[PDB]
């Protein structure tokens, strides 16, 4: 997977964007939120 932590988000709209982290660009990771599945940038914890 690619590294960090998703953001916090509202679970609607209810989209899918990717299958996995590496359907999204660069750092970006596919985070799900129950019914959504969204490319996010990460949170490092840093």
Known sequence: ??????PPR???P???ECKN???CP???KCCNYGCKD???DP????
Request: aromatic share 4%.
């Open 14 to 16: 209810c989209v899918k």
């Open 21 to 23: 982290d590496d359907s």
């Open 43 to 46: 949170i490092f914890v840093g």
């Open 1 to 6: 997977k690619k590294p960090g932590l998703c």
């Open 38 to 40: 969204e490319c996010r």
């Open 26 to 28: 660069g750092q970006q």
């Open 10 to 12: 509202p679970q609607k």
